[PDB]
């Protein structure tokens, strides 16, 4: 039934400054801005506290599937804050039993050529979502590093190269190859 | 003597219903910015529903068979045509009053245009419900001129923004003017608020 009220709080840290034009949070700090719109979620994004310390999200007269959004908005702002402060660092290790998936970034991070996958002549070119920047790591041999602020864009770009390197018309239990996400960490930990 | 209705923010059949009866009572109506009409129910839902209508054709000679109009104006016309007795003389006469446009062209681009709040999306739908823009719909089913209609409307909105700024400028001067004059309009301005305006 209609729950008379639900809410939550999102305690912003003193480094970051968040601001909300209505229902369109914009979060800025060390690394950069991250806007996100929630016109489509239907909530009261109050912002309270001197020093602007916490973001509150009411949701009045919600039914079960309307009250399910409350936390997911709150959480999306949490990631947004993390992105601004620390920034996300997805690491993905290449795997093969023969053909050593030859990776090479191109423009800056943007492009990812993925040559010699399974001994295929086809060279996979994979763009990155605006903001994300791939880079071939050191201190680990067959391993990529995708860094960026907007987690959504990062993890999508990770998937983009994960599904790029897919095996068709074979026993995938046998043929375990491709560039898989190994670790979802941050650019700096504190 | 003529309705002009901005079809933006309305509901396709909901507006068409109201337009039909106006049109049958001899009211000449114009319906403008028809691409902006929006239809309840999630997008995909309505695309299929249209695509079905496309499938309907007179097997032996499609050239005769139900003419599936793409343009949002003609779509909206089609749905209003479905609520009149359009095989009659009086029905055909009724449609001849109605005048529909994709976007908002030159007679009516400098006319104030009404809004049927009984067909309006913000009112008639729950906010958590989904709907479709009849533009998108029209576009994907083969409407040629979305982008053109967009490029012409950006001009119009820029052209209009100017008009509003000048309008505002007069309003402001008029607010100043009254204050400049309010001892030599004082025993007029008093009488216009005994009988209850200006308050």
């Amino acid at each position: 039934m209609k729950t008379i009220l639900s809410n939550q709080t999102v305690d912003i840290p003193e480094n970051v400054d968040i601001s909300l034009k209505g229902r369109t949070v914009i979060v800025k700090g060390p690394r950069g801005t991250l806007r996100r719109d929630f016109n489509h979620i239907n909530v009261e994004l109050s912002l309270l506290g001197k020093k602007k310390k916490r973001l509150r999200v009411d949701k009045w007269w919600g039914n079960r599937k309307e009250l399910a959004t409350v936390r997911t908005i709150c959480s999306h702002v949490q990631n947004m804050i993390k992105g601004v402060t620390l920034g996300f660092r997805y690491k993905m290790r290449s795997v093969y039993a023969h053909f050593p998936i030859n990776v090479v970034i191109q423009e800056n991070g943007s492009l990812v050529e993925i040559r010699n996958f399974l001994g295929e002549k086809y060279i996979r070119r994979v763009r990155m979502r605006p903001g994300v920047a791939c880079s071939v790591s050191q201190a680990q041999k067959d391993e990529l590093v995708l860094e960026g602020n907007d987690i959504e864009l990062v993890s999508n770009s990770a998937a983009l190269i994960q599904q790029a390197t897919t095996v068709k018309n074979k026993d995938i239990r046998k043929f375990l190859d491709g560039i898989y996400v190994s670790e979802k960490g941050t650019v700096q930990q504190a | 003597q003529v309705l002009v209705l901005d079809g933006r923010g309305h509901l396709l059949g909901r507006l068409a219903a109201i337009v039909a009866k106006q049109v049958l009572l001899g009211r000449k109506v114009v319906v403008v910015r028809c691409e902006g009409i929006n239809i309840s129910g999630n997008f995909y839902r309505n695309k299929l529903k249209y695509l079905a209508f496309l499938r309907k054709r007179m097997n032996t000679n499609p050239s005769r068979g139900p003419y599936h109009f793409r343009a949002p104006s003609r779509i909206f016309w089609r749905t209003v045509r479905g609520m009149l007795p359009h095989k009659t003389k009086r029905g055909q006469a009724a449609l001849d009053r109605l005048k529909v446009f994709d976007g908002i062209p030159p007679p009516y681009d400098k006319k104030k245009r009404m809004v049927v709040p009984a067909a309006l999306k913000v009112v008639r739908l729950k906010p958590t419900r989904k709907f479709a823009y009849l533009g998108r719909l029209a576009h994907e089913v083969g409407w040629k001129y979305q982008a053109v209609t967009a490029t012409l409307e950006e001009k119009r909105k820029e052209k209009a923004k100017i008009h509003y700024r000048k309008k505002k400028q007069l309003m402001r001067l008029r607010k100043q003017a009254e204050k400049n004059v309010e001892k030599k309009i004082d025993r007029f301005t008093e009488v216009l608020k005994t009988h209850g305006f200006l308050v």
């Binding site: - | 097997n59 032996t60 000679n61 050239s63 001129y145 012409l152």
Partner: protein
Amino acid sequence: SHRKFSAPRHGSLGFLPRKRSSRHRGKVKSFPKDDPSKPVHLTAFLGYKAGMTHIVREVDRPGSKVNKKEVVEAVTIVETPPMVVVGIVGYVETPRGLRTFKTVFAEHISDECKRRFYKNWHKSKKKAFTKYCKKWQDDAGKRQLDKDFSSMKKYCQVIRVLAHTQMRLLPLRQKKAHLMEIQVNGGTVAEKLDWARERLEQQVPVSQVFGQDEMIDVIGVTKGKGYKGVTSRWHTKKLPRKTHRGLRKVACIGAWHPARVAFSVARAGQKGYHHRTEINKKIYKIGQGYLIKDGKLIKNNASTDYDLSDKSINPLGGFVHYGEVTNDFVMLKGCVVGTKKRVLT
């Protein structure tokens, strides 16, 4: 019941009302998309199908069995004497479509061109564009002209030049020169228009439009064949010898119960003189016409670097049912639509 043994259906529905084309001169149904970036140019030309012949050439597709092997090859000669620009005509985008906006015609216009505007020239007093050309020599007119061009600069998007043929220079009977709108594809519309305003009343030859080893689309009307039966017009099976009411027919038009004969069923009607746009016809040779420095230069046509004789593409006794190709011509690979003498876009 189902038809027993399957078979793909005869003829394409993507081509029908198999009727006699309204036009004779094949329309360009779409010009290419003018990227605004590359410089201005014409997108089309109007030639004439003079005749076929061989070529011989070394081929260079490595891998093929025919790599570095001299093949022969058929070719069409399209005699293409230079066109004369006599107009421009501005268009504007609308949600309705692409409205023609303003047509500015040149000053002087040939009787080659003027012919076109009368159904009977012998009987006319030849009074066309007479009060028009008054505009081109006064203050009032020239100013209005400039304002028209300015308006086109403000408003228009697509610009097509109007040119026409030089019917004068051909072996054909007709004098009535074909006009045609040709689209100027290039930079910004103001640049685009001042190019066509410079070209006005001027010749334009073939080499200015096309270059060698270039795929081009031939547009024309097909060689017409009158009323033809279903066996000719659809390539339906003949029925056998014993058939009592004839055998160049279709037996079952249709089923009973969509109780109408469908548009997909094969019937006898007009075969030929259809409009058709065959694509990808590679230009092997853009050939220079006869010219004079002291004597004739007839050589410059059908001589090759390896042949070195004194030929023209004209064969002995000319191209049959045509003439001498005394003008510049293109030389496409393969056959193209239409008859000898046919105007060809």
